[PDB]
Amino acid sequence: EKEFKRLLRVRARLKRKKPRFLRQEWWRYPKFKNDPKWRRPKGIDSKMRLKLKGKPRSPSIGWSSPKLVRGLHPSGYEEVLVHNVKELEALDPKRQAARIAHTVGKKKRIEIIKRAEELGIKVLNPR
Amino acid sequence: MIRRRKKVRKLRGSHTHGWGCKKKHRGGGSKGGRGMAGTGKRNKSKWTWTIKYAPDHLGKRGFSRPPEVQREVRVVNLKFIDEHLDELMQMGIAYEEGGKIIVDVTQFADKVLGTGKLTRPLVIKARAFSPKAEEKIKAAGGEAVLV
Amino acid sequence: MKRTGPTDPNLRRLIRYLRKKSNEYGVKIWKDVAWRLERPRRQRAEVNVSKINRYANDGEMIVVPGSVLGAGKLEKKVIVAAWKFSETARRKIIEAGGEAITIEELIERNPTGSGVRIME
RNA sequence: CGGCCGCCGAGACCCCGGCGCACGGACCGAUUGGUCCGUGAUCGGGUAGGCGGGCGUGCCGGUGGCGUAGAAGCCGGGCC
RNA sequence: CAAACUCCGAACCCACCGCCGCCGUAGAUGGGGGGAGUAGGGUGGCGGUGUAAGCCGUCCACCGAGAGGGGAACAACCCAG
RNA sequence: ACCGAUAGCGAACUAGUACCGUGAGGGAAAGCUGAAAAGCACCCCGGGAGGGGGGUGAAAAGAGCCUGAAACCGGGCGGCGAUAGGAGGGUGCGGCCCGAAAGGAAUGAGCCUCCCCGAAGGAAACCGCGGCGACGCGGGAGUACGAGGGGAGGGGACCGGGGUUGCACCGUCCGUCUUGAAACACGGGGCAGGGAGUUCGCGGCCGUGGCGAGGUUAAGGGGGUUAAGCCCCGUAGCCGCAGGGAAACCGACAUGCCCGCAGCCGGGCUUAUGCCCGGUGAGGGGCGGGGUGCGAAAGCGCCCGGAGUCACGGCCGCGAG
RNA sequence: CUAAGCCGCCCGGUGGAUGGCUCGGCUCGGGGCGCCGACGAAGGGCGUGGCAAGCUGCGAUAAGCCCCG
């Protein structure tokens, strides 16, 4: 757990420092402001392509999270999407947390939550 | 079994599809002539390619007799005669008819060539022979009969 | 372009087992045969009973990292192990007095692979 | 003009942690895949262009599912 | 006095050998195959020409295709990839 | 395995209709209430259109009728706001404001206090000495400190995140030809939908799979079926098996030698991988010999010791828009 | 308790995208069927409904008349 906690803190700091990568001139037009995205600048005179100081930065392979904690919920568990009680049954309470699919109705959510709580399984969205 | 995707799917977004400057890939001028144009006869744009990769592209050579008059002669080797002698039994091309073994090569092949080696003696009934073929057969022990 | 390797799961498992066996017995024959088997399918080796007859000896073990074809004649008694055999090739091998086995059987009979000859 | 003494100053050089790539090695997965270890002062900019992996959309053959206790779609927000 | 002279003649460059150094069995040198793009270059030193700007070659150092720190801003200059 | 109302025929509908031109001829736009009209009875106001009550309906979905986005406009709310300069942004933080959920958190947040280790790096007080001087040298000392890594106690509700704006420094938009773009070079009022390496034939390659001295079927035929799927046959043909030559025409190594990589065998060094030496060595290379064309001949060109063919996918070449 | 003005959220108007639907298109191996006219054709003009303008259908018997199923 020592290394796990150290790397979890490292990832938290890294992803707090990381910026939001957005295409060039995203703020200038509604067509881009309403649909935020990142697109690689490919112009011959594109300052962002040249990577000049004072312009928005570009994504790089160095921003990746540490391998051990990559893709984990900030609480430290491994997320698993569940659509029914049978799917929830195949989960590991010690290391994985169930996320109930957005599409399942409250009727089924009731049994999913009951089974999770009687099995001691963490639920990220218990309602 | 191995299936992939066309290069266009990856090129979607490259603004040129790997053709160089945007002014390239226009048409007949880009190809330097439509088809075999400019191969040397009247225009020499591809003369440098013709003189190396397609010699004899321009010119005439000897004649050719009409297909009708030409005669076709089927040819077999004494290596085959021995290697596939077992198969001929089923179709009857070869048989015993006494102590010796008679193979009639008149239903397949006309002239017997002398490449390979002869192992077992036999009598082959052919119409044409080669000097080396007959020498090999005589040395092995069989015989050559001009049926 | 990329070399995707053999598509046959049996062949892939055989390659893995070959490398494992080489590591187990501390030899190089099986790893050599493995990297020869993983050759591109347009370059996989095919050998003929004629070549086996030319370069083999009676009571010898031969390994072909590919296919064995039945063009020619065989007169020696040899134990040949190859990925696949044609009907004519196997018939000739058997009629000559030898046996046509697989690489797995060759390993099972000769774990150390002493005296085995590679042919391509 | 001839010299000297301190200080300030980069993404350069040094150190710590992290990512990927190249090469070699050991393991598991029934097709291109996955985990870990070792070396890198002699790996990490990039236009034309070459190669590899991945993200997303409509339909079909299968497999496992969700939904009037509220699907698709739409506005705002949280997390990877 | 000599670009279209040489009784002489460097620096320097080239070919080959031996060795040091470096690369190479984790496969170099080399060989075969698939796919290109490139046929307007610029600055900087040198040579011929021109009153000069410039024109034409040569050297491969930098921009083209190159961030960051400076010369006030600067394509080429300095540190630096 | 076709499109799904800017798509698909031009026309999903009173579409070859409306409309344009003297004429030959050209030719659009336009689908959706609800289960049921139950399609708003009655009341106040207005000239009327309508407005406000009150009813119907699960829901106004109210006929200007499924859902109802973007651009644009009006109002409310949070921040800024009349001495301040840069393409409207970047880095860092400070005001004001929002913070239920999906992020952390009373199984304890911001915060406060205490103890330990510590990379690269790294002082000063104090004392002695050298230099005209700025200052430097030796001890202090590799000490204090140092990225980060750990432990303990106190307090008890915020941290992360978001909107706007303030300050410090930096930053002359996007696509394009071009040696060179902020350019007084070209294309750039805004938003939504549509939009540009497709198909066949032939040839060269590669990734994989089947069979293999053979490979493969085309047209078509039979069985079965809801069906064009599925099963079997079909050797015509095509390529390969023998090359050389204009043609007539002739017509070859199933290995006779030498090197030799991997692999295998014997030996030595070596804890093991590993290294060296010697033999054998598939594949690979060099000879020798052979077939044919030219030659009087020598001698040269090409070829000869068996790997091809079919299929799926991909890259490119030529012709078709 | 800032006039104008700029950014962000909420509500409203404008607009008709998106999603869902589909009696319409498009393409097909096989199957069916392939001519009409002087006994006046195709095509067209004009009429015809109680309220009837378009389309469709019909023809002074005019969204129709008669007979067998």
Give φ, ψ of B115 to 5 degrees: -105, 125
Question: How far is Cα B49 from Cα C120, in angstroms, rounded to an integer?
Answer: 39
Please tell me if residue B6 touches chain C, with a CB cutoff of 8 Å: no
Instruction: Beginning with the edge strand found earlier in the chain, give each strand of the sheet holding B94-95 in spatial order.
Output: B94-95, B102-104, B123-126, B143-146
Could you give the 3-state DSSP secondary structure of residue B41?
coil
Q: With CB atoms and an 8 Å threshold, state whether B83 touches C7.
A: no
B98-105 long-range CB contacts below 8 Å, 24 or more apart?
A: B104/B147, B105/B76, B105/B81
DSSP symbol at B34: S
Nearest to A99 by CA among A126, A69, A71, A70: A126
Chain C nearest CA to B88, separation (Å): 16
Crossing angle of helices C9-25 and C29-37, in 10° steps, is: 160
The partner residues of C101 in beta bridges, in order of sequence, read C81
**Beta carbons within 8 Å of A59's beta carbon, 6+ residues apart:** A21, A38
Cα B143 to Cα B103: distance, rounded to the nearest angstrom:
11
C1 to chain B, minimum CA–CA distance in Å?
A: 12
Q: 3-class DSSP state for residue B144?
A: strand
Of B1, B2, B83, nearest to C73 by CB-CB distance is: B83
Place of tokens 């939001």: A20
- Nucleotides in chain F with any atom closer than 7 Å to protein CB: 70-72, 88-92, 101-105, 149-150, 160-162, 170-171, 173-178, 181-183, 190-192, 197-198, 206-214, 242, 246-255, 262-265, 272-274, 281-283, 291, 304, 306-307, 312-320
Residue B1 has a CB neighbour count (10 Å cut-off) of 7
Bridge-based pairing of strands C116-118 and C99-101 is: unpaired
Q: Partners of C99 in the beta sheet? A: C79
Q: Which amino acid is at B3?
A: R
Q: Which of B117, B49, B22, B11 is nearest to C73 (CA)?
A: B117
Cβ neighbors of A55 (< 8 A, separation 6 or more) are A47, A48
SS3 annotation, chain C = CCCCCCCCHHHHHHHHHHHHHHHHHCCCHHHHHHHHHCCCCCCCEEEEHHHHHHHCCCCEEEEEEEEEECCCCCCCCEEEEEEEECHHHHHHHHHCCCEEECHHHHHHHCCCCCCEEECC
Distance CA A31, CA A24 (A): 13
B71, two tokens: 């005669």
> Would the CB atoms of B1 and C7 count as touching at under 8 Å?
yes
Q: What is the largest CA-CA distance in chain A?
A: 62
Residues A8 and A66: their CA atoms lie apart, in Å, by: 8
Nearest Cα neighbor of A88 from A104, A99, A103, A102 is A99
Q: How was this structure determined?
A: cryo-EM
Annotate chain A with three-state secondary structure. Answer: CHHHHHHHHHHHHHHHHCCCCCCCCCCCCHHHHCCCCCCCCCCCCCHHHHCCCCCCCCCCHHHCCCHHHCCCCCCCCEEEEECCHHHHCCCCCCCEEEEECCCCCHHHHHHHHHHHHHHCCCECCCC
Encoding tokens for residue C2?
């990329």
Type of residue numbered C9:
P
Task: Please indicate whether, in this complex, the C-beta atoms of C4 and B83 are within 8 angstroms of each other.
Answer: no
Is the CB of residue B125 less than 8 Å from the CB of residue B106? yes
- 3-class secondary-structure state, position B3: coil
- Cβ atoms C20, C33 nearer than 8 A: no
* Buried residues in A83-121 as b, exposed as e (16+ CB within 10 A): eeeeebeebeeeebbbbbeeeeeeeebeebbebbeeeeb
Shortest distance, CA C71 to any CA of chain B (angstroms) = 9
Strand F-contacting residues in B 46-65, CB cut-off 7 angstroms: 61-65
**Quick one: tokens of A115?**
């089974």
Q: What is residue B73's three-state secondary structure?
A: coil
Query: Cβ neighbours of residue A25 under 8 Å, at least 6 residues apart?
Result: A32
Contact C72 B83 (CB under 8 A): yes
**From its phi and psi, is residue B34 left (phi > 0), alpha (psi between -120 and 50) or beta?**
beta
Neighbours of C52 (CB within 10 A): 25
Q: C20-49 in b/e burial notation, b at 16+ Cβ within 10 A?
A: ebbeeeebebbbbbbebbbbeeeebbebbb
Residue with token string 């599409």:
A103
What is the bridge-based pairing of β-strands A78-82 and A96-100?
parallel
What's this structure's resolution in Å? 2.8
Task: Provide the 3-class DSSP secondary structure of residue B143.
Answer: strand
Q: What whole-number distance in Å separates Cα of residue B87 and Cα of residue B109?
A: 15
